[PDB]
Amino acid sequence: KSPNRLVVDEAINDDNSVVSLHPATMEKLQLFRGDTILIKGKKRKDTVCIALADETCEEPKIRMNKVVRSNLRVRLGDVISVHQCPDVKYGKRVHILPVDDTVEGVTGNLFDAYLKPYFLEAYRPVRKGDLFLVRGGMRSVEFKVIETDPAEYCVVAPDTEIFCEGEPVKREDEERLDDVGYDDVGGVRKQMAQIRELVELPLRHPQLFKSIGVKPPKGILLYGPPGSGKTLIARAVANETGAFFFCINGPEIMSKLAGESESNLRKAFEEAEKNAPSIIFIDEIDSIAPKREKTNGEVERRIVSQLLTLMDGLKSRAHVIVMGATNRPNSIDPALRRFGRFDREIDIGVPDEIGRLEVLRIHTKNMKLAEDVDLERISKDTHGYVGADLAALCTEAALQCIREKMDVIDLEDDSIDAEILNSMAVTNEHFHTALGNSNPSALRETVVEVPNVSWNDIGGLENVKRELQETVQYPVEHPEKFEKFGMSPSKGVLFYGPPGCGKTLLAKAIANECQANFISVKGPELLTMWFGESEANVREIFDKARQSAPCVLFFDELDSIATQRGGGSGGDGGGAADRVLNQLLTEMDGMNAKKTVFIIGATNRPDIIDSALLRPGRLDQLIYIPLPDEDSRLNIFKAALRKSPIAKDVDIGALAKYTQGFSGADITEICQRACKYAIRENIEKDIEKEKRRSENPEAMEEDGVDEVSEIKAAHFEESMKYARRSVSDADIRKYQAFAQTLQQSRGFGSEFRFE
Amino acid sequence: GNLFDAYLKPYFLEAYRPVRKGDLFLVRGGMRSVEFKVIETDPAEYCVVAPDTEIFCEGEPVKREDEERLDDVGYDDVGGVRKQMAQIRELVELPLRHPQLFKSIGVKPPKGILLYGPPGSGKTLIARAVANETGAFFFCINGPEIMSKLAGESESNLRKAFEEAEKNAPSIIFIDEIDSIAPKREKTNGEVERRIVSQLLTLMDGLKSRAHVIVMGATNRPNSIDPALRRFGRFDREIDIGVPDEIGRLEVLRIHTKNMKLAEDVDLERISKDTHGYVGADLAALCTEAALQCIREKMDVIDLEDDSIDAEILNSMAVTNEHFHTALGNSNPSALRETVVEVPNVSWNDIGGLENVKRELQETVQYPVEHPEKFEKFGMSPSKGVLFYGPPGCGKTLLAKAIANECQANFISVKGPELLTMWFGESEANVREIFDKARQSAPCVLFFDELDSIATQRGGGSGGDGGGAADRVLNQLLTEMDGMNAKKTVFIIGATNRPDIIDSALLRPGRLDQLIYIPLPDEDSRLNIFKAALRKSPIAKDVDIGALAKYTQGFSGADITEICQRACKYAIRENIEKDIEKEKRRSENPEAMEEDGVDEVSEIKAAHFEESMKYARRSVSDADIRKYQAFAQTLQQSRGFGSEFRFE
């Protein structure tokens, strides 16, 4: 294996003529940064590129994009040869023609529309016969290079002539460059990695499994909310590995007559086996094999059995992978997930803020977004949006831009000029309107997130922070030393104290600091899961916690369900609170084996909490969160005002001294009322602009920077007029009569000295 | 490749294995097994392999003769089911190994066997092993395949199978997934659904006389099928293939890694301890994932490609502990909710004190079962109901586990929340199922914990006046305990923390009528508990323990364990801070020397114990002790009766 032989890799930058290598890789071949490098591919193909040094890449791997790989007829992870050749010289004339399959409906000067920005200031190497993709005008166009002066390869220069006259060329056997790839899917990085590591061996190296004799995975079930992108992921995996893709739709198979439905699956399996390696995607598999409780027999029980038979009908491996897709794991019957039929399961959940931003950037790559568009704000605003909703939002923004452009020009005809299409810019107003018009679809889904709260957002509670670190961070980040002492740490924490003191913030901060997933569940949410209880849902939550390890499972508002039976709980009819409490106890007893899931509970009435929760193996550790002291009150005031442009004539310290018995929520409410007063004052000052000009039309422009109207001492004094304490004095002593009994430290202070 | 150095060189290394011309042998390696057939040898027919003996191997592979495959399932390919394997072997040894004897004796042999357990537990594996190791003919019937086909064809397939099996007697018919063919009669689906099952029943009676044919069913739950299948003659035998225990899981892991070259650092015992709720299929998948991870790591550095990997390359792959750890972390169990019938590892030495309770438990439990021939001599039947009461966290569950282990009896643990969680639209059979699982596992100890949730008195000391959940379960428990007295080898032990509010229906004779009070440990027992909790922790030499026991008054065993846990956490923090010094010093001075002179143990010192004792909390108030004493004395009647009864 010569040093000039490497393994291709996917690149972060999507430039069509840029290849990234580590400096150590280039040192072995005398390659320098910014040079011109030839790469040889398969089936007698080759390309020319330029090199950039990136330290993130590794020596064995070379980074390229999809277009270069398509030109080289190679796939990801394949082996290529890299050579250097200084014969690449400046060319005089290069003749390029577009592809007929992509230029339908657009007629005009494609030169200034696409090629002029494409070759502007970039010395992109060009080889005769290759193809490249240009994105613009809300579409993508394939251009195939026809001729060039310097033999086969050349460098485009400002003085180089670019010939483009001629009819569009006809597509050859080369694959489409607009098909789905790994760059067309966003927010599913972990699941994408799992699927890639599951399917890399059976697909990229099939014959190896004839030699080793180990059975590769066969059945994969993807589940998630509709529109989350299961089919997109399947198609991307199939395309980027070069596999043959056969798509089976559940409605189509089920709709057809009996016997035909059984024959279609057999034909599909036969074709996939004959065209191995291949991927069979059974879209919407829930319709074919529903749960056995349906009690509908005859034909309903035939095909599913046949399906099971045909799942076992694959007598031996044939480089064939079946990929199911449903909405809920419990929707299908258990017999489908036996050993050999469907062994692998992946959850494609609703994306988070970063995933939503990635999807938005994916769906706007053909659009010319204006400079004022802020996709980060849109990603923050869209909560409960699946990728389909984001795609629809982008389409609506594009359509609004098209409507605004057509409002002023009556283009009509049959083909819009390419320059006109490229001149359309989508602004922030279109996105705002489309976002306001649209509605989410995955609001009720349990979100598994990594919170943004850190320790710096919490005012005080330093001892609680230290105890939480010792309790949570060490068992997971440093597990190799806990086993040395032979003592297994407890995984149950219960925060108790006055309401609005920072228990949820502490849970989010400890989840974020350990870089662990966070799941938040409330008592009303547990009770709302139908009073004709579907008792599996609670278990589902723990299941979602089990596959997301490491994770922090936070239960809030336990006082609604976790009250003692009869002694301190209303509703003696029962069946709702007691049932959920028993299910929680059983799940917490059964969760001890995961070793990486921490359960945190919060309550505001620790005296009436059920004693069954405090037993070992359950939330047996108790932490008391008190009202913040004056230093912590100063910290909370500073934290609440981290963004508000507060005026310089402020004290804050006397605010902390004055606010006794006020919780953090009360401080936040005081700041909110001060902000409202400042808003009112700013509005009244803005009204002066209209009033003065109405009283005198000859008034001059007074728009000398907008009046900030900072939070001044007057606003704070007005807000403090009705500042209400949320906790009475009796609450503090009630909590103290539980903390001291749960500490046993008033009489044990430095009184145990032994040698 | 060079199969010689790959397989034969280690096979004949230092072993003087006799070799006969014409035989075959199996060599395991490279994640596979290879059959080698001996062709020739110099000393006539038999010879002894020696280091100076030439080994010729050049030539094409031979073609398989009528000899059976050596990779087929056998008794060594099944693990963790030793008792059930013995039962099946003793049930099928006579009809299969000695068939014609049943034409002479005239006694009807067993015909129908139903194996049940969680999916993936290994029912088909057991059936195939039994069929192969007895030389019987094996016909496999799959429920989905029979049910899927059209009407009339489904009835004809069973008839053809029975005809073929009878014509090729002795034989075993395995009806895999029999639950689909004959579900419970409550399905209320008629016509075809009622045809085949009836036909099945007919074909179960269609075997007019014995024909050296054994039918072997396989379902998931005994109550899933209709009762008419288990009539006299159709399906008379039933075996439960439950989820394996730690030893069974270790056996399965060793079974599935016999073709793999495990590295020296692999500790399968830790994996067996870690995997809880894993059926054999899950363990097989885990081993396959570890092997695949090893293959990926090996392919990461070499681009072998071609079409056939060299045998030496395959044999060079070693599976390490990191691969097993990663695969175990990735995998998830499948039998978590199954009732586990285990033999606990707790012994008397793990319990601090309670010597009188240990003696009473021995007299109550061990003697009636280990020495039953002398109880009948006196003519008095011992009671089988014990109720532990006392403060929480004092060792009632430990006592139950220890008494189960000392008698070498199975242990089943059930909690009140588990009983209530069995749907509030109660499937009332589940409680009975537990007792049924106790009945077939005799001798067994059935331990009920946290009875205070369901066993409170009706109305007087129980919340939720709507009813239907706690009272129903209490009535079912009373009925089952009344009906359990006939087994003579099942002991029911209950534990509660509020004996004053317990229902008086439980204390009647024939039920948990014996009461034992477990008190807070005394100072000697506190010393014993401190010693037991620290049996593995490397405690420092500057410790007293005795003054710890003296100081901890009103602290339960759980409190002592929590104190030790907090001390361990403090030691962990100190060790982490000391480890950070290795990075800090080298960052402040890159020319620092290697200070890795054995890892700092950071033993539990007096400072850690003193820090932990700062917030050491008593879990029981002083009122709890007197509340329990106001029940113990009334349940003992011994304050006024001490050595006051002297008669001759």
Ligand SMILES: Nc1ncnc2c1ncn2[C@@H]1O[C@H](COP(=O)(O)OP(=O)(O)O)[C@@H](O)[C@H]1O
């Ligand atoms: N994670 C994602 N990234 C980018 N696009 C997505 C994503 N999820 C869904 N989409 C878009 O949604 C459209 C249809 O979604 P689809 O995959 O059919 O839904 P389902 O997964 O329920 O079958 C696709 O055209 C795709 O562009």
Ligand SMILES: Nc1ncnc2c1ncn2[C@@H]1O[C@H](COP(=O)(O)OP(=O)(O)O)[C@@H](O)[C@H]1O
């Ligand atoms: N110690 C604190 N530091 C910063 N913010 C706080 C603190 N305590 C309360 N807050 C504010 O109070 C609001 C709600 O408090 P929350 O944590 O929900 O109360 P609880 O602990 O009762 O759930 C949060 O938005 C948070 O900003």
Ligand SMILES: Nc1ncnc2c1ncn2[C@@H]1O[C@H](COP(=O)(O)OP(=O)(O)O)[C@@H](O)[C@H]1O
């Ligand atoms: N006790 C066991 N020992 C060894 N392997 C087992 C055991 N139980 C299950 N397996 C493995 O599980 C695989 C399939 O299990 P199977 O017997 O088909 O499940 P079921 O019993 O539900 O039909 C078999 O290939 C076997 O190797």
Ligand SMILES: Nc1ncnc2c1ncn2[C@@H]1O[C@H](COP(=O)(O)OP(=O)(O)O)[C@@H](O)[C@H]1O
């Ligand atoms: N006498 C004792 N000897 C040893 N350990 C004990 C003792 N009492 C309590 N423990 C410890 O307390 C923990 C839980 O006690 P447990 O037996 O569950 O209490 P309960 O009897 O209320 O069920 C166990 O892990 C055990 O190690």
